[PDB]
Structure 1
Amino acid sequence: DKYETNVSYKKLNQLAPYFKGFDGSFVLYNEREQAYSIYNEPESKQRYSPNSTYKIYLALMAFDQNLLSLNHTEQQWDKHQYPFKEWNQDQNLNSSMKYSVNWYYENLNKHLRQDEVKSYLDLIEYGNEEISGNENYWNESSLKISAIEQVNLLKNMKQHNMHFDNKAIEKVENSMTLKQKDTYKYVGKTGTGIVNHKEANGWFVGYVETKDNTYYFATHLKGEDNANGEKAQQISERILKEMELI
């Protein structure tokens, strides 16, 4: 249920107003200073379903297993009518990440042996590593990860500490790039979990890369409703702008 760590951190308790209406957390890791800053340390260690934020690592596993190639990420739509018309069309990695196209990533998972998935989640230390709850174990099911762990995995990915190809990481980074200026690249991914027909679990995770540093972040929202990726991203952008990072 909870990630155990004793790392020191700077308290960010005056970020509380941004989380009106939610039990929330914000985690920041400053790469140059090797330093964490956290709002709501108890929630930062609580593990929650990753929902669409898991697509990052399904993409990487798929490259590593050669289901996807640096120049070959297209998948054909099978004509199932989804309620989101963005999903009702052929996709590549960039479009599937942008439009958070579940079937693209479900197909990837279907062609990964679940024993291989367990091995990957062990190696990258993906939260509770529990994938037995449902075929789509990352969607409001058994697999859960905390906000600090989301930051840790992004930093391990970008710092080339995972056993994934650097060019595959670049492709996944590109697929989640939200803004690129001369002074910074802003990368991130939303997620939303539905419980009792309400938005009860919102994520936004990513990083800002500047010309001299990288700032990794994760925002989590818990609530009875309205806790979704869009709101988690809005709060994140308010915080990051106050930090003068974007």
Structure 2
Amino acid sequence: DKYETNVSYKKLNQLAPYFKGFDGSFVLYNEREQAYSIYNEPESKQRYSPNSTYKIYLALMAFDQNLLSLNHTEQQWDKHQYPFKEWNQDQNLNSSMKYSVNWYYENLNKHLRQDEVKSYLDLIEYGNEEISGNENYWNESSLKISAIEQVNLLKNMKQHNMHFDNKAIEKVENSMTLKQKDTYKYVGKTGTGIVNHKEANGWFVGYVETKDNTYYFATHLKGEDNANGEKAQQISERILKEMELI
């Protein structure tokens, strides 16, 4: 599925070497100039399972539904042993996001009404809005979003155009804050998805907020293997340093 937009963008073709091994895309939005820059425009419109980057909105939804309160984000670990040790304990919003603990977000979804969620995705324009596929519709399932839409949503959230509480947004933003300096705030969320037993869907979405601007971005990777959140973030970090933002 494909996101249709005839928005203008600066071409970022010389980012191609960063995507060696991948069908990848990089979208930047410059809040002040109100301007997109894109490596690989066709790939920037292709919709893919957002995977773990969906946790961001799943969190905003749980807040809005008073499923999460500002001083109540803690969830009990039910004692199931996972392949990654960070998951094998109680979590709060911050840790759940830092370690990408799926069960935290699967509990959030389990307690939201599918129809409230459908309504949210309609409001926020979350890609194809297909949550019909399975229970974990955001994991290599029916729900798909493009790198450019990932940027539009972050921008819309941060410019308070989503009907979510400002403190809800602040909490969610804090949970994905990777670096906090005098001169910038650096926020992001990774995503990995497996198809055909290979890491084939890599996301890193976020933004850098400086003292006079905010540069929202999304990097997406598609490839035979090693297309993962970590690689996507590594690629994004290189690109962002080279534009001199991080």
TM, length-normalised to structure 1: 1.00
- Work out the CA distance in 2 between the residues paired with 1:102 and 1:68: 16
* Alignment partners' CA distance in 1, 2:228 and 2:21: 12
Once the two structures are TM-superposed, the CA of residue 28 in structure 1 deviates from its matched residue by 0.2
Secondary structure of 1:10's counterpart equals strand
> Which whole-Å deviations, capped at 9, do the CAs of 1:146-177 have from their partners, x for residues lacking one?
00000000000000000000000000000000
Residue 83 of structure 1, CA deviation? 1.3
Q: 1:82 deviation in Å?
A: 1.2
| Equivalent residue number for residue 114 of structure 1 | 114
Counterparts of residues 35-184 of structure 1 (less than 5 Å):
35-184=35-184
Equivalents in 2 of 1:79, 1:132: separation in Å?
29
Query: Can you list the C-alpha shifts for 1:176-213, whole angstroms capped at 9, x where unaligned?
Result: 00001000000000000001111000000000000000
- Distance in 1 (alpha carbons) for counterparts of 2:114 and 2:50: 18
Counterpart CA distance in 2 for 1:62 and 1:110 is 10
* CA shift for structure 1 position 226: 0.5
3-state SS of 2:97 partner: helix
Task: Give the superposition deviation at 1:132.
Answer: 0.7
Deviations along 1:86-140, one digit per CA (max 9) or x if unpaired, are: 1110000000000000000000000000001000000000000000111000000
Measured in 2, the distance between the counterparts of 1:181 and 1:224 equals 37
Give 1:29 shift.
Answer: 0.2
The 5 A counterparts of 1:6-17 are 6-17=6-17
Q: Percent identity?
A: 100
After TM superposition, give the deviation of residue 2 of structure 1 in Å: 0.2
Distance (Å, rounded) in 2 between the aligned partners of 1:195 and 1:111 = 27
Using the alignment, how far apart are the partners of 1:219 and 1:226 within structure 2?
Answer: 14
Q: Distance in 2 between matches of 1:80 and 1:15?
A: 42
Rounded to whole Å, the distance in 2 between the matches of 1:84 and 1:35 is 39
Structure 2: distance between partners of 1:188 and 1:203 = 10
* Deviation for aligned residue 1:85: 1.3
CA distance in 2, matches of 1:200, 1:90: 30
Deviates more, 1:79-88 or 1:172-181: 79-88
Unpaired runs of at least 5, structure 1: none
Distance 1:94 1:15 in 2: 32
Measured in 1, the distance between the counterparts of 2:80 and 2:232 equals: 30
Output the aligned Cα RMSD: 0.4
C-alpha separation between the residues in 2 aligned to 1:186 and 1:81?
Answer: 32
Runs of 4+ in 1 over 2 A off after TM superposition: none
Superposition deviation, residue 225 in structure 1: 0.4
How far does the alpha carbon of each residue in 1:32-75 deviate from its partner, in whole angstroms, 9 at most, with x for none? 00000000000000000011000000000000000100010000
Post-superposition offset of 1:84: 1.2
Tell me the distance in 1 between the aligned counterparts of 2:226 and 2:80.
28
Query: Equivalents in 1 of 2:184, 2:85: separation in Å?
Result: 32
Task: Give the distance between the partners of 2:26 and 2:83, measured in 1 at CA.
Answer: 32
